[PDB]
């Protein structure tokens, strides 16, 4: 199916003392594979997946130098935006950046992304055509005017259509034994009486990859949303994900309810029933 590479950068100023904190993480699909943390000892981009470790020292040197330079750009930008917003230098503020590319099942470019935030709100974003910008406010509009004059979109686009897709393909092949295998959800249901007359059925999905999944409850074959609850999909910590959905039912009527599990690793949706 389709695949994605994404990088997430967070820069947080530290007005009491010293340089902003800068954290960068890189993902292929739902697998982290690199990180940089300005507070760490290496001062280097570091591997976080086994299949990236085979890259040679020229890879790590280049990636370290590019991410450090970007971190210094974020430093300058925190000062610039403080001025645009007329903010005091007493306060801590945050810039966030997400960017990357998707390839389709053919391994060819599908879509590119570049989006920036300030203090958790949209600031400026590259549009889907990779030729225009959306600025959320008048401060971002200044940036947009500067980036148009600098032809920033063209530089962003060349990366997203070029090196981004080229190295995504390389990672997917080098990491294929995990990156291109699906782990279907391991499912089961639990029963919890809450009274002499009611019970909670909880439908569990465990150990799946990728994280995208749909859990739905049906009563007598009809989608049921009343008296249900769904938790946010969460990481297990071993690279897989977990989720559950629950329903309150009249005791003795459990057999009417079915949990339906949809996932990329499932040729057919799974149906579970407390029998």
């Amino acid at each position: 199916g389709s695949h994605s590479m994404r990088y997430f950068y967070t820069s947080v100023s530290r007005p009491g003392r010293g340089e902003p904190r800068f954290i960068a993480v890189g993902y292929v699909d739902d697998t982290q594979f690199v990180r940089f943390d300005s507070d760490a000892a290496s001062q280097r981009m570091e591997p976080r997946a086994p299949w990236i470790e085979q890259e040679g020292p020229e890879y790590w040197d280049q990636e370290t130098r590019n991410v450090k330079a970007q971190s210094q750009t974020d430093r300058v930008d925190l000062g610039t935006l403080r001025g645009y917003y007329n903010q005091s230098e007493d306060g801590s503020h945050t810039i966030q950046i997400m960017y990357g590319c998707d390839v389709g099942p053919d391994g060819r470019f599908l879509r590119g992304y570049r989006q920036d935030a300030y203090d958790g709100k949209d600031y400026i974003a590259l549009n889907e055509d990779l030729r225009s910008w959306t600025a959320a406010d008048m401060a971002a509009q200044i940036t947009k005017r500067k980036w148009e004059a600098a032809h920033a979109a063209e530089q962003q686009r060349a990366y997203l259509e070029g090196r981004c897709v080229e190295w995504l393909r390389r990672y997917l092949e080098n990491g294929k034994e995990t990156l291109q295998r699906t782990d279907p959800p391991k499912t089961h249901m639990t029963h919890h009486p809450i009274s002499d007359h009611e019970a909670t059925l909880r439908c569990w999905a465990l150990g799946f990859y990728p994280a995208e999944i749909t859990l739905t409850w049906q009563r007598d074959g009809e989608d049921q949303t009343q008296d249900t609850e769904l938790v946010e999909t969460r990481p297990a910590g071993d690279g897989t994900f977990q989720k559950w959905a629950a329903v309150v039912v009249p005791s003795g009527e459990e057999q009417r309810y079915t949990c339906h599990v949809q996932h990329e690793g499932l040729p057919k949706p799974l149906t579970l029933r407390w029998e």
């Binding site: 590019n66 997203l160 981004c164």
Partner: peptide, 9 residues
């Protein structure tokens, strides 16, 4: 790989 260093805001 990461993108290159960009234009300042």
């Amino acid at each position: 790989v990461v993108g290159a260093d960009g234009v300042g805001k």
